[PDB]
Short mmCIF file of C-alpha atoms in Angstrom, two decimals:
data_model
loop_
_atom_site.label_atom_id
_atom_site.label_comp_id
_atom_site.label_asym_id
_atom_site.label_seq_id
_atom_site.Cartn_x
_atom_site.Cartn_y
_atom_site.Cartn_z
CA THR A 1 -6.39 -27.17 -37.07
CA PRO A 2 -5.15 -30.18 -35.08
CA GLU A 3 -7.12 -28.80 -32.13
CA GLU A 4 -10.28 -29.49 -34.14
CA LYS A 5 -9.42 -33.17 -34.56
CA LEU A 6 -8.49 -33.24 -30.87
CA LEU A 7 -11.74 -31.67 -29.64
CA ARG A 8 -14.71 -32.25 -31.94
CA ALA A 9 -13.59 -35.44 -33.71
CA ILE A 10 -12.62 -37.32 -30.54
CA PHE A 11 -15.53 -36.17 -28.37
CA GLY A 12 -18.13 -36.49 -31.13
CA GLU A 13 -19.44 -32.95 -30.55
CA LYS A 14 -19.71 -32.13 -34.26
CA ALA A 15 -21.98 -29.09 -33.90
CA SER A 16 -19.24 -27.85 -33.56
CA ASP A 17 -18.67 -24.12 -33.12
CA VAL A 18 -21.26 -21.95 -31.38
CA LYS A 19 -21.88 -18.22 -31.03
CA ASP A 20 -23.86 -16.52 -28.27
CA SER A 21 -27.03 -14.92 -29.65
CA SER A 22 -29.33 -15.26 -26.65
CA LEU A 23 -32.12 -12.69 -26.28
CA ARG A 24 -30.63 -10.87 -23.31
CA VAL A 25 -32.77 -8.51 -21.25
CA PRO A 26 -32.28 -4.91 -22.45
CA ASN A 27 -30.24 -2.99 -19.90
CA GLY A 28 -31.79 -0.57 -17.43
CA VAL A 29 -35.00 -2.52 -16.75
CA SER A 30 -35.85 -5.20 -14.19
CA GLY A 31 -38.83 -7.50 -14.57
CA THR A 32 -40.69 -10.69 -13.76
CA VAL A 33 -41.42 -13.21 -16.51
CA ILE A 34 -45.18 -13.72 -16.21
CA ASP A 35 -46.06 -15.41 -19.52
CA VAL A 36 -43.99 -17.34 -22.05
CA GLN A 37 -45.37 -18.31 -25.47
CA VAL A 38 -43.99 -21.04 -27.74
CA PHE A 39 -45.08 -21.07 -31.40
CA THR A 40 -43.76 -24.01 -33.43
CA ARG A 41 -44.42 -24.76 -37.09
CA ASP A 42 -45.55 -28.36 -37.50
CA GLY A 43 -42.35 -29.50 -39.20
CA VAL A 44 -39.93 -29.37 -36.27
CA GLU A 45 -40.13 -31.78 -33.34
CA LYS A 46 -41.05 -29.70 -30.30
CA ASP A 47 -38.92 -30.01 -27.16
CA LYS A 48 -40.05 -30.97 -23.65
CA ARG A 49 -41.13 -27.50 -22.52
CA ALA A 50 -43.26 -27.01 -25.64
CA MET B 1 -14.29 -45.39 -29.49
CA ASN B 2 -14.77 -45.97 -33.22
CA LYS B 3 -11.14 -46.22 -34.43
CA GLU B 4 -10.96 -42.41 -34.61
CA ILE B 5 -9.49 -41.15 -31.31
CA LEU B 6 -6.13 -42.80 -31.98
CA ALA B 7 -6.08 -41.48 -35.56
CA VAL B 8 -6.85 -37.96 -34.32
CA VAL B 9 -4.16 -38.21 -31.64
CA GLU B 10 -1.55 -39.42 -34.14
CA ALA B 11 -0.72 -36.38 -36.27
CA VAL B 12 2.05 -37.60 -36.29
CA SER B 13 4.12 -34.52 -37.14
CA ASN B 14 3.77 -32.64 -33.84
CA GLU B 15 0.90 -34.06 -31.79
CA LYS B 16 2.36 -37.60 -31.75
CA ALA B 17 6.00 -36.60 -31.21
CA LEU B 18 5.98 -38.67 -28.01
CA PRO B 19 4.33 -42.10 -27.76
CA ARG B 20 0.60 -42.32 -28.35
CA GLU B 21 0.20 -43.39 -24.71
CA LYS B 22 1.27 -39.94 -23.46
CA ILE B 23 -1.10 -38.09 -25.81
CA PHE B 24 -3.95 -40.45 -24.90
CA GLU B 25 -3.24 -39.93 -21.20
CA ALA B 26 -3.23 -36.14 -21.62
CA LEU B 27 -6.51 -36.19 -23.55
CA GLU B 28 -8.08 -38.53 -21.00
CA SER B 29 -6.92 -36.30 -18.13
CA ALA B 30 -8.50 -33.30 -19.85
CA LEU B 31 -11.73 -35.27 -20.35
CA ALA B 32 -11.70 -36.36 -16.69
CA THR B 33 -11.19 -32.76 -15.56
CA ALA B 34 -14.11 -31.66 -17.75
CA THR B 35 -16.30 -34.44 -16.33
CA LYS B 36 -15.34 -33.52 -12.76
CA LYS B 37 -16.24 -29.90 -13.51
CA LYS B 38 -19.58 -31.11 -14.89
CA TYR B 39 -20.04 -33.50 -11.95
CA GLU B 40 -21.99 -32.10 -9.01
CA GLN B 41 -19.75 -33.83 -6.45
CA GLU B 42 -16.11 -32.77 -6.09
CA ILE B 43 -14.81 -36.28 -6.71
CA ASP B 44 -11.47 -37.10 -8.32
CA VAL B 45 -11.35 -39.47 -11.29
CA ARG B 46 -8.70 -40.54 -13.78
CA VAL B 47 -9.37 -41.66 -17.35
CA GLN B 48 -7.29 -43.98 -19.53
CA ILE B 49 -7.83 -44.23 -23.30
CA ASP B 50 -6.27 -47.27 -24.94
CA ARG B 51 -4.59 -46.54 -28.27
CA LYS B 52 -5.84 -49.82 -29.74
CA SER B 53 -9.50 -49.36 -28.74
CA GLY B 54 -10.03 -45.65 -28.05
CA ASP B 55 -12.69 -46.09 -25.35
CA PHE B 56 -11.63 -43.84 -22.46
CA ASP B 57 -12.38 -45.80 -19.30
CA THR B 58 -12.75 -43.49 -16.29
CA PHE B 59 -12.17 -44.75 -12.74
CA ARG B 60 -12.82 -42.58 -9.69
CA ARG B 61 -9.81 -42.66 -7.38
CA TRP B 62 -10.10 -42.73 -3.59
CA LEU B 63 -7.25 -40.58 -2.18
CA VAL B 64 -8.35 -41.39 1.35
CA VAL B 65 -7.85 -38.50 3.77
CA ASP B 66 -7.46 -38.88 7.54
CA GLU B 67 -10.83 -37.16 8.10
CA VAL B 68 -14.50 -38.13 7.77
CA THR B 69 -15.56 -35.29 5.45
CA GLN B 70 -16.53 -36.17 1.85
CA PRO B 71 -17.06 -39.94 2.25
CA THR B 72 -17.28 -40.34 -1.54
CA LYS B 73 -13.70 -39.06 -1.89
CA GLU B 74 -12.20 -39.33 1.62
CA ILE B 75 -12.71 -42.16 4.13
CA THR B 76 -10.79 -44.04 6.82
CA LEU B 77 -10.62 -47.51 8.35
CA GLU B 78 -12.96 -46.46 11.18
CA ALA B 79 -15.81 -45.96 8.70
CA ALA B 80 -14.73 -49.07 6.77
CA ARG B 81 -15.02 -51.15 9.97
CA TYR B 82 -18.66 -51.72 9.01
CA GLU B 83 -17.37 -53.38 5.83
CA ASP B 84 -14.71 -55.25 7.91
CA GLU B 85 -12.04 -52.69 6.84
CA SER B 86 -10.78 -54.51 3.75
CA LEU B 87 -8.36 -51.64 3.04
CA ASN B 88 -6.33 -49.48 5.40
CA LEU B 89 -6.90 -45.75 5.73
CA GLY B 90 -5.02 -43.35 3.48
CA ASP B 91 -5.12 -45.61 0.42
CA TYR B 92 -5.03 -43.67 -2.87
CA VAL B 93 -5.89 -46.64 -5.11
CA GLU B 94 -8.96 -46.64 -7.33
CA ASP B 95 -12.22 -47.56 -5.59
CA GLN B 96 -14.94 -46.29 -7.96
CA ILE B 97 -15.68 -45.68 -11.64
CA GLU B 98 -18.17 -43.79 -13.82
CA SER B 99 -20.15 -45.29 -16.69
CA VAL B 100 -20.01 -42.43 -19.21
CA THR B 101 -20.03 -38.63 -19.24
CA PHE B 102 -22.14 -36.76 -21.79
CA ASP B 103 -19.84 -33.69 -21.85
CA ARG B 104 -22.26 -31.44 -23.74
CA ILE B 105 -22.80 -28.29 -21.65
CA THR B 106 -19.10 -28.40 -20.68
CA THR B 107 -17.94 -27.85 -24.28
CA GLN B 108 -16.25 -24.54 -23.45
CA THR B 109 -14.46 -26.10 -20.47
CA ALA B 110 -13.38 -29.01 -22.69
CA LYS B 111 -12.00 -26.56 -25.25
CA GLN B 112 -10.10 -24.68 -22.53
CA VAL B 113 -8.72 -27.98 -21.22
CA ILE B 114 -7.70 -28.91 -24.78
CA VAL B 115 -5.84 -25.60 -25.14
CA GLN B 116 -4.12 -26.22 -21.79
CA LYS B 117 -3.21 -29.74 -22.93
CA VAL B 118 -1.78 -28.36 -26.18
CA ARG B 119 0.36 -25.94 -24.17
CA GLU B 120 1.44 -28.80 -21.89
CA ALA B 121 2.34 -30.94 -24.92
CA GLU B 122 4.42 -28.08 -26.33
CA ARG B 123 6.20 -27.78 -22.97
CA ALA B 124 6.75 -31.55 -22.91
CA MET B 125 8.26 -31.48 -26.41
CA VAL B 126 10.49 -28.58 -25.35
CA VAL B 127 11.65 -30.57 -22.31
CA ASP B 128 12.18 -33.65 -24.48
CA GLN B 129 14.34 -31.81 -27.02
CA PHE B 130 16.03 -28.71 -25.60
CA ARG B 131 16.28 -29.79 -21.95
CA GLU B 132 17.59 -33.23 -22.93
CA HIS B 133 20.00 -31.53 -25.35
CA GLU B 134 20.87 -28.75 -22.85
CA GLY B 135 19.26 -26.20 -25.15
CA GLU B 136 20.52 -25.03 -28.53
CA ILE B 137 23.96 -23.41 -28.15
CA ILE B 138 24.06 -21.83 -31.61
CA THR B 139 23.46 -18.46 -33.24
CA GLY B 140 19.78 -17.69 -33.73
CA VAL B 141 17.24 -14.95 -34.39
CA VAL B 142 15.52 -13.25 -31.46
CA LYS B 143 11.72 -13.41 -31.46
CA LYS B 144 10.69 -11.50 -28.31
CA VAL B 145 12.38 -8.39 -26.88
CA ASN B 146 11.39 -7.88 -23.24
CA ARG B 147 12.91 -5.44 -20.75
CA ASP B 148 16.63 -6.32 -20.77
CA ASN B 149 15.72 -9.76 -22.12
CA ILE B 150 15.81 -11.52 -25.49
CA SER B 151 13.82 -14.70 -26.18
CA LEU B 152 14.72 -16.67 -29.32
CA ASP B 153 12.96 -19.61 -30.97
CA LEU B 154 15.15 -22.46 -32.21
CA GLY B 155 14.54 -25.49 -34.38
CA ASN B 156 12.55 -28.53 -33.26
CA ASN B 157 10.37 -26.28 -31.06
CA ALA B 158 13.38 -25.36 -28.90
CA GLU B 159 13.61 -21.97 -27.21
CA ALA B 160 16.28 -19.94 -25.44
CA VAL B 161 16.45 -16.82 -23.29
CA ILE B 162 19.20 -14.28 -22.59
CA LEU B 163 19.54 -12.83 -19.10
CA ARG B 164 20.08 -9.14 -18.44
CA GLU B 165 23.57 -9.77 -17.05
CA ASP B 166 24.36 -12.10 -19.96
CA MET B 167 24.01 -9.24 -22.47
CA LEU B 168 25.94 -6.00 -22.78
CA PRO B 169 25.09 -3.43 -20.07
CA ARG B 170 24.60 -0.64 -22.62
CA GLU B 171 23.46 -2.52 -25.73
CA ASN B 172 19.77 -3.43 -26.02
CA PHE B 173 18.40 -6.18 -28.26
CA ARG B 174 15.37 -6.06 -30.54
CA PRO B 175 13.23 -8.75 -32.19
CA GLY B 176 14.68 -10.22 -35.36
CA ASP B 177 18.28 -9.44 -34.37
CA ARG B 178 21.09 -11.88 -33.52
CA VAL B 179 22.14 -12.74 -29.96
CA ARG B 180 25.18 -14.88 -29.14
CA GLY B 181 24.94 -17.08 -26.05
CA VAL B 182 25.83 -20.63 -25.03
CA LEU B 183 22.87 -22.34 -23.36
CA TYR B 184 23.79 -24.05 -20.09
CA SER B 185 20.56 -24.33 -18.05
CA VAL B 186 17.15 -25.31 -19.46
CA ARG B 187 14.86 -24.23 -16.64
CA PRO B 188 11.48 -26.03 -16.83
CA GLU B 189 9.39 -22.88 -17.17
CA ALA B 190 5.71 -22.76 -18.08
CA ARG B 191 4.87 -23.19 -21.79
CA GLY B 192 8.23 -24.59 -22.82
CA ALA B 193 11.65 -24.71 -21.17
CA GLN B 194 13.55 -21.60 -22.24
CA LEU B 195 17.30 -22.19 -22.27
CA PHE B 196 19.46 -19.83 -20.20
CA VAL B 197 22.75 -18.50 -21.57
CA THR B 198 25.51 -16.48 -19.91
CA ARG B 199 28.35 -14.67 -21.69
CA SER B 200 30.74 -14.58 -18.75
CA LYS B 201 33.16 -17.48 -19.40
CA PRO B 202 36.11 -17.95 -21.79
CA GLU B 203 34.72 -21.27 -23.06
CA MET B 204 32.46 -19.57 -25.62
CA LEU B 205 35.30 -17.41 -26.93
CA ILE B 206 37.65 -20.41 -27.10
CA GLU B 207 35.05 -22.43 -29.02
CA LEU B 208 34.41 -19.53 -31.42
CA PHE B 209 38.12 -18.97 -32.07
CA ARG B 210 38.97 -22.68 -32.42
CA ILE B 211 36.70 -23.20 -35.44
CA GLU B 212 38.12 -20.16 -37.27
CA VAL B 213 41.78 -20.94 -36.43
CA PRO B 214 43.45 -23.00 -39.20
CA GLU B 215 46.07 -24.28 -36.74
CA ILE B 216 43.37 -25.46 -34.32
CA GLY B 217 41.34 -26.95 -37.17
CA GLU B 218 44.37 -28.85 -38.48
CA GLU B 219 45.43 -29.79 -34.90
CA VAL B 220 48.87 -28.26 -35.51
CA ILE B 221 48.65 -26.12 -32.35
CA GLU B 222 46.60 -27.06 -29.29
CA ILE B 223 45.16 -24.41 -26.98
CA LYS B 224 46.16 -24.99 -23.36
CA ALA B 225 44.03 -22.22 -21.81
CA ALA B 226 41.82 -19.28 -22.72
CA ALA B 227 40.86 -16.10 -20.86
CA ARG B 228 37.81 -13.93 -21.50
CA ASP B 229 35.57 -11.67 -19.43
CA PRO B 230 32.70 -9.41 -20.55
CA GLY B 231 34.05 -5.87 -20.34
CA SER B 232 37.21 -6.82 -18.41
CA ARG B 233 39.52 -8.89 -20.62
CA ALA B 234 39.51 -11.18 -23.66
CA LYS B 235 42.62 -12.85 -25.08
CA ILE B 236 43.14 -15.81 -27.41
CA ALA B 237 46.24 -17.99 -27.12
CA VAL B 238 47.18 -21.43 -28.45
CA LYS B 239 50.30 -23.52 -27.86
CA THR B 240 52.36 -25.11 -30.64
CA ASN B 241 53.49 -28.68 -29.93
CA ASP B 242 56.98 -28.11 -31.36
CA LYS B 243 55.45 -27.64 -34.83
CA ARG B 244 57.09 -24.22 -35.47
CA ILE B 245 53.85 -22.23 -35.44
CA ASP B 246 53.05 -18.69 -34.35
CA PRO B 247 50.66 -18.52 -31.37
CA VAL B 248 49.58 -14.94 -32.13
CA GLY B 249 49.01 -15.75 -35.80
CA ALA B 250 47.07 -18.91 -34.97
CA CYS B 251 44.89 -17.12 -32.41
CA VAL B 252 44.23 -14.09 -34.64
CA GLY B 253 43.21 -16.22 -37.63
CA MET B 254 43.00 -15.04 -41.24
CA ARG B 255 43.95 -11.34 -41.18
CA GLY B 256 42.15 -10.81 -37.87
CA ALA B 257 38.74 -11.89 -39.17
CA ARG B 258 38.36 -14.48 -36.40
CA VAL B 259 39.06 -11.86 -33.72
CA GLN B 260 36.53 -9.47 -35.28
CA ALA B 261 33.91 -12.24 -35.43
CA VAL B 262 34.55 -13.26 -31.81
CA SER B 263 34.37 -9.63 -30.67
CA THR B 264 30.65 -9.45 -31.46
CA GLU B 265 29.94 -12.58 -29.42
CA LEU B 266 32.18 -11.32 -26.59
CA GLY B 267 29.86 -8.40 -25.83
CA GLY B 268 31.68 -5.89 -28.04
CA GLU B 269 35.06 -6.30 -26.33
CA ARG B 270 38.01 -6.36 -28.71
CA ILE B 271 39.69 -9.76 -29.13
CA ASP B 272 43.49 -9.76 -28.95
CA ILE B 273 45.91 -12.58 -29.79
CA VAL B 274 48.59 -13.40 -27.21
CA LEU B 275 51.46 -15.88 -27.31
CA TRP B 276 51.62 -19.15 -25.38
CA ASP B 277 54.63 -21.00 -23.98
CA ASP B 278 55.16 -24.30 -22.20
CA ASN B 279 57.57 -22.90 -19.60
CA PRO B 280 55.56 -21.01 -16.93
CA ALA B 281 58.19 -18.27 -16.67
CA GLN B 282 57.95 -17.72 -20.43
CA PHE B 283 54.20 -18.45 -20.37
CA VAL B 284 53.51 -15.49 -18.05
CA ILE B 285 55.24 -13.08 -20.45
CA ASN B 286 53.55 -14.75 -23.43
CA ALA B 287 50.08 -14.36 -21.89
CA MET B 288 50.89 -10.79 -20.82
CA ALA B 289 50.67 -9.80 -24.50
CA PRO B 290 50.09 -7.21 -25.88
CA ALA B 291 53.15 -6.16 -23.85
CA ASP B 292 56.93 -6.58 -23.68
CA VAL B 293 59.05 -9.32 -22.13
CA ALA B 294 60.07 -7.69 -18.85
CA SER B 295 58.38 -9.87 -16.18
CA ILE B 296 60.63 -12.71 -15.00
CA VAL B 297 60.09 -14.67 -11.78
CA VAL B 298 60.57 -18.27 -10.66
CA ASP B 299 59.48 -20.24 -7.60
CA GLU B 300 60.65 -23.47 -6.00
CA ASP B 301 57.32 -25.30 -5.67
CA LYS B 302 54.64 -22.64 -5.24
CA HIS B 303 52.73 -21.20 -8.20
CA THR B 304 53.12 -17.61 -6.96
CA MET B 305 55.20 -15.25 -9.09
CA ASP B 306 55.87 -11.54 -9.56
CA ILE B 307 55.42 -9.43 -12.69
CA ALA B 308 57.68 -6.54 -13.70
CA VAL B 309 57.02 -4.23 -16.65
CA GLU B 310 57.80 -0.71 -17.83
CA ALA B 311 55.85 2.23 -16.41
CA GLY B 312 54.30 3.11 -19.77
CA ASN B 313 53.16 -0.48 -20.37
CA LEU B 314 52.32 -1.18 -16.71
CA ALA B 315 48.60 -0.71 -17.43
CA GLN B 316 48.62 -2.51 -20.78
CA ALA B 317 50.43 -5.62 -19.52
CA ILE B 318 48.25 -6.21 -16.44
CA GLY B 319 46.55 -3.00 -15.35
CA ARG B 320 45.42 -1.96 -11.88
CA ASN B 321 41.87 -3.06 -12.75
CA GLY B 322 43.09 -6.36 -14.21
CA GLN B 323 42.19 -5.38 -17.79
CA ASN B 324 44.75 -7.96 -18.93
CA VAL B 325 45.83 -9.53 -15.61
CA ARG B 326 43.07 -12.14 -15.84
CA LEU B 327 44.85 -13.33 -18.99
CA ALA B 328 48.14 -13.95 -17.17
CA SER B 329 46.28 -15.72 -14.36
CA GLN B 330 44.47 -17.95 -16.87
CA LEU B 331 46.35 -18.15 -20.20
CA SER B 332 49.70 -18.86 -18.47
CA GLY B 333 49.04 -21.13 -15.47
CA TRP B 334 50.92 -18.80 -13.12
CA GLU B 335 50.28 -15.95 -10.72
CA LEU B 336 50.02 -12.39 -12.04
CA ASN B 337 50.82 -8.97 -10.61
CA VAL B 338 50.05 -5.36 -11.54
CA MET B 339 53.09 -3.27 -10.60
CA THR B 340 56.28 -1.73 -11.97
CA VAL B 341 59.90 -2.89 -11.88
CA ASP B 342 60.53 -0.56 -8.94
CA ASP B 343 57.91 -2.37 -6.84
CA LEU B 344 59.47 -5.76 -7.61
CA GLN B 345 62.96 -4.44 -6.79
CA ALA B 346 61.70 -2.99 -3.50
CA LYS B 347 59.99 -6.27 -2.60
CA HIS B 348 63.17 -8.24 -3.37
CA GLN B 349 65.28 -5.83 -1.32
CA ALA B 350 62.85 -6.03 1.61
CA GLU B 351 62.85 -9.84 1.47
CA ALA B 352 66.66 -9.93 1.38
CA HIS B 353 66.89 -7.49 4.30
CA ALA B 354 64.40 -9.51 6.35
CA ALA B 355 66.30 -12.73 5.62
CA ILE B 356 69.61 -11.11 6.59
CA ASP B 357 68.12 -9.71 9.81
CA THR B 358 66.67 -13.12 10.72
CA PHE B 359 69.96 -14.88 9.97
CA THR B 360 71.96 -12.38 12.04
CA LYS B 361 69.93 -13.14 15.17
CA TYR B 362 69.46 -16.85 14.38
CA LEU B 363 73.11 -17.78 13.70
CA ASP B 364 74.89 -15.60 16.32
CA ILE B 365 77.53 -14.72 13.70
CA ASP B 366 79.01 -11.25 13.24
CA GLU B 367 76.86 -8.73 11.38
CA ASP B 368 79.44 -8.07 8.66
CA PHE B 369 80.09 -11.79 8.12
CA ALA B 370 76.35 -12.52 7.94
CA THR B 371 75.82 -9.68 5.46
CA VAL B 372 78.71 -10.90 3.29
CA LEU B 373 77.37 -14.47 3.37
CA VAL B 374 73.79 -13.37 2.58
CA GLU B 375 74.63 -10.83 -0.16
CA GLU B 376 75.77 -13.59 -2.55
CA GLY B 377 72.17 -14.58 -3.27
CA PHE B 378 68.61 -14.01 -2.15
CA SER B 379 67.46 -16.15 0.80
CA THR B 380 70.91 -17.73 1.03
CA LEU B 381 70.91 -18.19 4.83
CA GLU B 382 67.64 -20.12 4.93
CA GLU B 383 66.89 -23.86 4.75
CA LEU B 384 70.54 -24.79 4.29
CA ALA B 385 69.88 -28.47 5.02
CA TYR B 386 66.75 -28.63 2.85
CA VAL B 387 68.27 -26.82 -0.15
CA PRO B 388 71.12 -28.47 -2.10
CA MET B 389 74.63 -27.96 -0.76
CA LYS B 390 75.76 -26.59 -4.14
CA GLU B 391 73.78 -23.38 -3.50
CA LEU B 392 74.28 -22.77 0.23
CA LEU B 393 78.03 -23.50 -0.01
CA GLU B 394 78.99 -22.36 -3.52
CA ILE B 395 81.47 -19.80 -2.20
CA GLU B 396 84.71 -20.96 -0.60
CA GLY B 397 86.09 -19.97 2.82
CA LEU B 398 83.66 -20.93 5.60
CA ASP B 399 82.21 -23.87 3.70
CA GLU B 400 82.56 -26.30 6.62
CA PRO B 401 80.73 -24.06 9.16
CA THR B 402 77.92 -23.31 6.69
CA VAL B 403 75.92 -26.33 7.92
CA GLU B 404 76.00 -24.94 11.47
CA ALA B 405 73.09 -22.59 10.70
CA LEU B 406 70.95 -25.69 10.07
CA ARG B 407 72.46 -27.97 12.72
CA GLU B 408 71.71 -25.42 15.44
CA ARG B 409 68.29 -24.65 13.95
CA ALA B 410 67.28 -28.32 14.06
CA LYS B 411 67.76 -28.34 17.84
CA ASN B 412 66.46 -24.79 18.36
CA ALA B 413 63.22 -25.20 16.38
CA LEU B 414 61.45 -25.78 19.71
CA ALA B 415 62.56 -22.36 20.96
CA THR B 416 61.85 -20.81 17.55
CA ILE B 417 58.23 -22.01 17.67
CA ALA B 418 57.88 -20.50 21.15
CA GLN B 419 57.48 -16.99 19.72
CA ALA B 420 54.77 -18.28 17.37
CA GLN B 421 52.92 -20.30 20.03
CA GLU B 422 53.27 -18.78 23.52
CA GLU B 423 52.85 -15.18 22.31
CA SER B 424 49.17 -15.36 23.29
CA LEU B 425 49.94 -16.79 26.74
CA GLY B 426 50.20 -13.36 28.35
CA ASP B 427 48.80 -10.98 25.73
CA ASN B 428 45.03 -11.58 25.68
CA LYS B 429 45.01 -15.20 26.77
CA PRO B 430 42.06 -17.20 25.40
CA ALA B 431 39.02 -17.76 27.59
CA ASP B 432 35.65 -19.51 27.34
CA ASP B 433 33.99 -16.21 26.36
CA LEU B 434 35.44 -16.20 22.83
CA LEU B 435 37.73 -19.20 22.26
CA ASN B 436 35.10 -21.74 23.39
CA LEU B 437 32.22 -20.04 21.56
CA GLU B 438 30.32 -22.45 19.33
CA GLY B 439 30.08 -21.68 15.63
CA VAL B 440 33.65 -20.40 15.12
CA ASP B 441 36.86 -21.94 13.83
CA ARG B 442 40.11 -22.52 15.72
CA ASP B 443 41.62 -19.36 14.20
CA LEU B 444 39.01 -17.25 16.04
CA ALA B 445 40.90 -17.65 19.32
CA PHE B 446 44.17 -16.60 17.66
CA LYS B 447 42.47 -13.59 16.07
CA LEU B 448 40.97 -12.56 19.42
CA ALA B 449 44.35 -12.95 21.13
CA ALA B 450 46.12 -10.89 18.45
CA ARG B 451 43.41 -8.19 18.42
CA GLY B 452 43.63 -7.57 22.18
CA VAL B 453 40.05 -8.70 22.90
CA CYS B 454 39.81 -10.96 25.95
CA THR B 455 36.27 -10.49 27.28
CA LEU B 456 32.97 -11.08 25.52
CA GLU B 457 31.73 -7.57 26.39
CA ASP B 458 34.15 -5.96 23.92
CA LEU B 459 33.07 -8.37 21.17
CA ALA B 460 29.39 -7.75 21.93
CA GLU B 461 29.89 -3.97 21.84
CA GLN B 462 31.41 -4.18 18.36
CA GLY B 463 29.21 -4.97 15.38
CA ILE B 464 30.03 -6.61 12.05
CA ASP B 465 31.66 -3.87 9.96
CA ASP B 466 34.29 -3.23 12.64
CA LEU B 467 35.22 -6.93 12.80
CA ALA B 468 35.10 -7.27 8.99
CA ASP B 469 38.52 -5.59 8.70
CA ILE B 470 40.18 -8.96 9.41
CA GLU B 471 40.20 -11.14 6.30
CA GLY B 472 40.47 -14.35 8.34
CA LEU B 473 37.01 -14.06 9.91
CA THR B 474 33.95 -12.85 8.03
CA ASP B 475 31.60 -10.21 9.41
CA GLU B 476 28.67 -12.64 9.67
CA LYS B 477 30.51 -15.12 11.90
CA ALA B 478 31.78 -12.40 14.26
CA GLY B 479 28.33 -10.83 14.42
CA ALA B 480 26.71 -14.18 15.20
CA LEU B 481 29.28 -14.87 17.93
CA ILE B 482 28.74 -11.41 19.45
CA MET B 483 24.96 -11.87 19.35
CA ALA B 484 25.24 -15.29 21.00
CA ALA B 485 27.49 -13.88 23.73
CA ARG B 486 25.11 -10.98 24.35
CA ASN B 487 22.11 -13.32 24.48
CA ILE B 488 23.93 -15.59 26.95
CA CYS B 489 24.85 -12.60 29.13
CA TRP B 490 21.25 -11.36 29.05
CA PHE B 491 19.52 -14.71 29.67
CA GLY B 492 21.98 -16.57 31.89
CA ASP B 493 19.20 -16.85 34.47
CA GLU B 494 18.59 -20.42 33.28
CA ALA B 495 21.59 -22.75 33.18
#
């Protein structure tokens, strides 16, 4: 579509389409995040929090 | 900024319909809005993307307010006095700029701004084409059918809309159908300027009939006027310029096909062909068609005339509701009337009797002599000096003393005007309560004097409907005058 050339081509954001697949908290339960674990295979460059 | 933004902007089928500067400005405005949304501070910036380069340079504008809040986007000369006040307060010129905006987390906002800019570009193209061309006044196919409304899409991204009053009161439109309407107002609505049409004028019917009339197409007969009204009247008439042509045949077309075609565009009203004549006396009868030639009336200078017709055809010729009278008022260039021959005869007899009675008391002649002199013709004893002597003195006998009725009247006009002028001197003489009231015309004093009202209390007691019976003064003006008088009477404590 011309909107594609208007948006992703001009801005350079060539990801370009995204879909929400975040691990949302299951409904009905509260909580407090006490421990977070990050396991990364040694092929991918780990981010700042890792 | 790599020789790609301009190429993306130039479609050039639809995106680059206007100059590349406008598209670049719209895209840069969307980018600036996205950056401002991403920016923590509520600053205002404007971006400009050159078509040759593509690098969108963003400069933060000032828009200086007369307050001290938000110094990054609103300042005054008092705060600038530290910097010697190089610029006066209230300046909206640019005073800041931003290096570059990442615009990564704001991708959804940028997409929404791009959609809004696409809608704005569609509206701009609609304004550039339909609004500059006053819409598309042509037959089309309806696309949307809203409640008593039809929206149609035309070529070159043009659009049109049909009002509820513009369509038939009983007929309802549906998508994909055909709606006839001449666009005359392209209102700049959101998401395109939908043209507005109204089927309430004879211009559309005249234009429709002219194309399908061989006489009009060949310029043999020229149409002088046309009359049409949705649900009231619709007649087609053309005038032959001494070319020996039939007006009814020219207006009807080829075996009535033109009338049938125009009937659909006229809101379902049947289209009838009437004759046209150059002489107004003949033109009234010609435009009275379908009827018979029984209405004859002439006037000296005024355009007013009377219409006489048979009792059976009294409703077909004009009609008490005007079902054809609007034709005679329009397609003939003369006044129309809805009555019978008896009414016209009674009016003529009453006018003759009034003229005879006035002449009897204005000329001091004997009653029998005045009646004999006035029975030769209507309004004979009136304006003898102004009218030609061949009419006021056609009969023999007292031809020499005929000019006496004007010679005496020339001197006695001062006494004649006394009854018209000094009648209000004793009967409800004007006062400052009503005659001097602000917001009224000079005829208000005469109306008050002729209605018997002299004091403001009587006017204040009455409302608007009671005073609306007089056609000279509207109900609103009388009500406003009464309210002003009542307010003055209530609050005359202060001078």
